[PDB]
Structure 1
Amino acid sequence: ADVQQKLAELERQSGGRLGVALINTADNSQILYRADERFPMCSTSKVMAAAAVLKQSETQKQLLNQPVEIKPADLVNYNPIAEKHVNGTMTLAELSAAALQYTDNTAMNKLIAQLGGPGGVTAFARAIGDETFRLDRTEPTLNTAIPGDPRDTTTPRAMAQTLRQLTLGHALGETQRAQLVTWLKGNTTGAASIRAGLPASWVVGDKTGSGGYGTTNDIAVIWPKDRAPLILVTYFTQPQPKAESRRDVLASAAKIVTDG
């Protein structure tokens, strides 16, 4: 029984390029497949941006309650939460929840702007020891996912490490760490992705992403039953510009790497 064989078979049969990094926090062990290749993050980058604003809030203690104007011109495909508040305001906490738990691209843009642009999200990544991540565009163009383009990419291994530090480690202050985890656990978009490959009894927080080239991503923190948590990154992208999403590939990869 061979995890590399299974992942290579999934990838080949899918017609795409699959990247996987698992961290088992029980013993610091990893399962890696194309873990040092760059992939387009798409909306999985919203974790870094929300965590950056959380970090800000450790020193601007009322920042999460700050109202932010939502104008009709701010609407970008998709905006299921912000469209309801156009011509009004949303707080940075509401925006962070919207960006994380829903598909909300306008909410992401407000986080980016709060951080002073894409470079602000990259600067946070650098501050917490992630030298791989880069954010260079706003929404929606950060999702173009063109093959060979390094913009708005990271590697599975780096993002697994970062997500571990953010959700289980000490990148954030305790309240901010707990907030992030509460938001990820309340994600609405994830049941077809990593979670579909796992036993139903396991608890998952996750952020999904999807863009050009059939790019289909998920990053997750997982609590198996009375076991130590796992961090799992599954990235996937395809050769055709308009390929269909493949959440089932991410599910299949999550089952392969957690079986046993």
Structure 2
Amino acid sequence: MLTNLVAEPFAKLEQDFGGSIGVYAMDTGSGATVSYRAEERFPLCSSFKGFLAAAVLARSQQQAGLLDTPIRYGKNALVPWSPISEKYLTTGMTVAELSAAAVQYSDNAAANLLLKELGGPAGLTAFMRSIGDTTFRLDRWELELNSAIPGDARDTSSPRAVTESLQKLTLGSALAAPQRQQFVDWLKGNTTGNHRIRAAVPADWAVGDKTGTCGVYGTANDYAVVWPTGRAPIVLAVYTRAPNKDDKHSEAVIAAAARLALEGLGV
């Protein structure tokens, strides 16, 4: 199995990190998959925002005009790290702009505003159930969902479920064609992941990704769809945690895990 090829280097990497690393990667060309702690739960942190944007896009298939709807919000909506929605407080933003801000800058006010319109964490969880994801659960809002408490299943998923759902939404049939491409375009425009999966791929590959960084408990992550030039894409997810609250996350560890995953698939 391809999992067997990389089991020992993954174990070395997470011992060096001082925590747990979960990876799932699938080659959509061959069907090969690489697994390491891929069914364990890890905190989503801000990475839930990608699926949040997909849920909004799904809703736009039934509700015509949803994306262009202007949304006004008060200053009490501004949560720490709302760098985009901060700048449009006095003006408002459209639903599509909030979605792009949530994905591409991890804007917290934008994410909470969209979560509200979707019916809160249970509403996003329901969307994930509707595409066949039985693992994902969102329970809380920004920023409480980042507590990343050891053993706590709230606001978690697994690397395998994240990868399978990402595949359905970006490459499969879970979204209609125009919405699927919009989701991919938002992921391609992400600004926060240059040191994670993007650092593991060749310079000529196209990448769409979403990051998460709880910070506490050494907890951070990244998931991505990547396209080798002229080849079928790879979908992968890399999640980390660690036992102590003051343990530091590591972007280099995430990039290194992505490299091992790609090497295991034969790329």
Shared fold (TM-score, shorter chain, > 0.5): yes
What is the letter of the counterpart of residue 198 of structure 2?
R
Alignment of 1:211-230 (within 5 A): 211=214, 212-230=216-234
Mapped to 1, the partners of 2:244 and 2:86 lie a distance apart of 31
Alignment of 1:166-245 (within 5 A): 166-211=169-214, 212-245=216-249
Q: 3-state DSSP class of the match of 2:231?
A: coil
What is the letter of the counterpart of residue 122 of structure 1?
T
Mapped to 2, the partners of 1:12 and 1:25 lie a distance apart of 30
Contact 1:70-1:82 at 8 Å conserved across structures: no
Mapped to 2, the partners of 1:64 and 1:205 lie a distance apart of 20
Shift of 1:27: 2.1
Shift of 1:70: 2.2
Mapped to 2, the partners of 1:32 and 1:180 lie a distance apart of 26
One of 240, 249, 255 as aligned partner of 1:251: 255
User: Which position in structure 1 is the counterpart of 2:57?
Assistant: 54
User: Which position in structure 1 is the counterpart of 2:152?
Assistant: 149
**1:116-163 per-position Cα deviation (integer Å, ceiling 9, x unaligned):** 111000000011110110011010011111110100000111110000
Structure 2 unaligned residues grouped into runs of 5+? none
TM-score (norm 2): 0.95
One of 78, 83, 89 as aligned partner of 2:81: 78
Contact 1:70-1:85 at 8 Å conserved across structures: no
Mapped to 2, the partners of 1:69 and 1:50 lie a distance apart of 18
User: Which position in structure 2 is the counterpart of 1:29?
Assistant: 32
Does residue 70 of structure 2 align to residue 67 of structure 1? yes
Does residue 14 of structure 2 align to residue 11 of structure 1? yes
Mapped to 2, the partners of 1:158 and 1:64 lie a distance apart of 27
Mapped to 1, the partners of 2:207 and 2:236 lie a distance apart of 10
Mapped to 2, the partners of 1:254 and 1:157 lie a distance apart of 14
TM-score (norm 1): 0.97
One of 137, 140, 143 as aligned partner of 1:140: 143
User: Which position in structure 2 is the counterpart of 1:123?
Assistant: 126
Mapped to 1, the partners of 2:94 and 2:81 lie a distance apart of 19
Structure 1 unaligned residues grouped into runs of 5+? none
Contact 1:95-1:108 at 8 Å conserved across structures: yes
Counting aligned pairs with the same residue, the percent is 52
Mapped to 1, the partners of 2:85 and 2:193 lie a distance apart of 20
User: Which position in structure 2 is the counterpart of 1:89?
Assistant: 92
What is the letter of the counterpart of residue 32 of structure 1?
S
One of 101, 113, 128 as aligned partner of 2:116: 113
Mapped to 2, the partners of 1:85 and 1:45 lie a distance apart of 23
Shift of 1:245: 2.7
Shift of 1:203: 1.1
Does residue 23 of structure 2 align to residue 20 of structure 1? yes
| Deviating 4+ runs (over 4 angstroms) | none
Which has the larger displacement, 209-218 or 172-181? 209-218
Q: 3-state DSSP class of the match of 1:6?
A: helix
Shift of 1:215: 1.0
One of 150, 154, 161 as aligned partner of 1:158: 161
Q: 3-state DSSP class of the match of 1:166?
A: helix
Mapped to 2, the partners of 1:240 and 1:151 lie a distance apart of 18
User: Which position in structure 2 is the counterpart of 1:99?
Assistant: 102
